[PDB]
Structure 1
Amino acid sequence: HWGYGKHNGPEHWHKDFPIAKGERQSPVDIDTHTAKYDPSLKPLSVSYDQATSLRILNNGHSFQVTFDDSQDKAVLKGGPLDGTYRLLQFHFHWGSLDGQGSEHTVDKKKYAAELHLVHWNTKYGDVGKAVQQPDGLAVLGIFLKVGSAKPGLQKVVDVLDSIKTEGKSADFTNFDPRGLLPESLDYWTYPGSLTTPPLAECVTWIVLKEPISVSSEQVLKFRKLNFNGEGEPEELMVDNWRPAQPLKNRQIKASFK
């Protein structure tokens, strides 16, 4: 079973998932001087006013908040996308210390954490079909730096003690993901992959330029989670990030000058 440790981490994943060495893997370093401004890119449309959160879950690799994706209630459109993408879940990647934790990097800078909002293309009907398509998913990535608290994150932080170990879940209704977004929707975009197994090459990545700030207390609570199940030796859930992968033949485009 894959993980983030010495014997089962990112350098091992290609054995079970050979696409790990593919042509469009994620994350990548975003070299800001090389990314090209594309004036043909549209503003991103984020429509989360009718979002219906369901549950919060420790899945042994991260924690996730899951949404009702059975109707067009929380959707991503525009930007680099053709068509409509339904929000399924969000989750985070973070470090053992504030100088690492993000998956994407910016001019080799690592942020303390990275938020991923995962959406799937309604033209494929369900997420399982969407991951088999090159335009199946759109993941909105948001960097976290440590400073001032993010008020809209606190409701998440306060329930993490109830999902400490792998397999635990709780009710998590009425959570508004608009409270996790920065002011600007300026972004970089490129064609890539899931950053966890199965590493499928099905993602249009949209990475926001502006980070959100979270407090040291908020990120400390992330770091109290466990990779292990209850009853097994305690292993802190920290450093659950894949490093930057080769860009190969891809262009990163910027929505802004």
Structure 2
Amino acid sequence: HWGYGKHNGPEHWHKDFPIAKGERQSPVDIDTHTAKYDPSLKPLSVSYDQATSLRILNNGHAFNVEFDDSQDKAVLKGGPLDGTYRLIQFHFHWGSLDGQGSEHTVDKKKYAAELHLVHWNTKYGDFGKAVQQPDGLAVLGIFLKVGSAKPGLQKVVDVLDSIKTKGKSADFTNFDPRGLLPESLDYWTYPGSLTTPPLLECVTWIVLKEPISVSSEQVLKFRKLNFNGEGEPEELMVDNWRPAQPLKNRQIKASFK
């Protein structure tokens, strides 16, 4: 099965998922000088006041915080988007060292980690149908750098010891994802894909310019997670990022000048 190792990592994914070599794959390098300011882009609307988290799960490739998306309660709209997109989960990608971990890069710079808040277009009724559409998902990407702690992340960090290995899950209620956002909602946007198999080309990417800061101790706890299942040889869950893919026929637009 696919993963992030030498024999099953990103360079292998195309064998099971040929769209890996497609025309709108993610992530990409964001060349900030070539990104075009688009005055027609609207401010992003992030309405997370009623978000309701349900569970946290180690799926063998990341940990997902999964939300109750059965009502209109945590929505992303505006920006480049037409209509309303509902939050279903978030997860991170991170490195074995602070110098790598992000999937998107900015002028080739890698951040220590990257948060993905995954939303589906309500016009398609649920997530499974949305991923089959070219405008099915909107993923809000936020870079993490190591410095001061992010207090709003600590509740996540502190449950990780209970989901150390693949397949483990725990109840995880009342987590407020507003605590993971930076001050500014200035962003870049482009059309792309899921960055994990099945790599479907269904995502409008919205990548915030301002990173959040997390502490070294916080990211060190991410690195204690395992790719393997319980009672298997320990392989730390680190470097679970796909590298930048060819931009091909795409333009990255900036909401800011």
Q: Is TM-score (shorter-chain normalized) higher than 0.5?
A: yes
**Equivalent residues, number:** 257
Question: 2-side partners of 1:156 and 1:41: how far apart?
Answer: 33
Partner of 2:212: 212
Q: In angstroms, what is the RMSD of aligned CA positions?
A: 0.3
1:103-146 per-position Cα deviation (integer Å, ceiling 9, x unaligned): 00000000000000000000000111100100000000000000
2:245 aligned with 1:237, yes or no? no
TM-score for the superposition, normalised by structure 1:
1.00
Q: Deviations over 1:149-198 (max 9, x none)?
A: 00000000001000000000001000000000000000000000000000
The match for 2:121 is 121
TM-score by length of 2: 1.00
CA distance in 2, matches of 1:175, 1:202: 27
CA offsets, 1:29-73, max 9 Å, x none? Answer: 000000000000000000000000000000000001000000110
User: Residues of 1 paired with 2:234 and 2:71: CA distance?
Assistant: 39
Q: Distance in 1 between matches of 2:211 and 2:166?
A: 29
> What is the Cα deviation at residue 231 of structure 1?
0.7
1:5-35 CA-to-partner distances (Å, cap 9, x unmatched) read 0000000000000000000000000000000
CA distance in 1, matches of 2:186, 2:72: 24
Give the CA deviation at 1:226. Answer: 0.1
Q: Percent identity?
A: 97
Gaps of 5+ in 1: none
Give distance in 2, aligned partners of 1:108 and 1:170: 36
Q: Could you report, residue by residue, the CA deviation over 1:220-251 in whole angstroms, capped at 9, with x for unpaired residues?
A: 00000000000110000000000000000000
Partner of 2:56: 56
2:64 is paired with a residue whose SS is strand
Taking the aligned partners of 2:121 and 2:161, their CA distance within structure 1 comes to 34
Cα offset for 1:87? 0.1
Show the 5 A alignment for 1:102-251.
Answer: 102-251=102-251
- In 2: Cα distance, 1:177 partner to 1:245 partner: 28
Could you tell me which runs of 5 or more consecutive residues in structure 2 were left unpaired when the two chains were aligned.
none
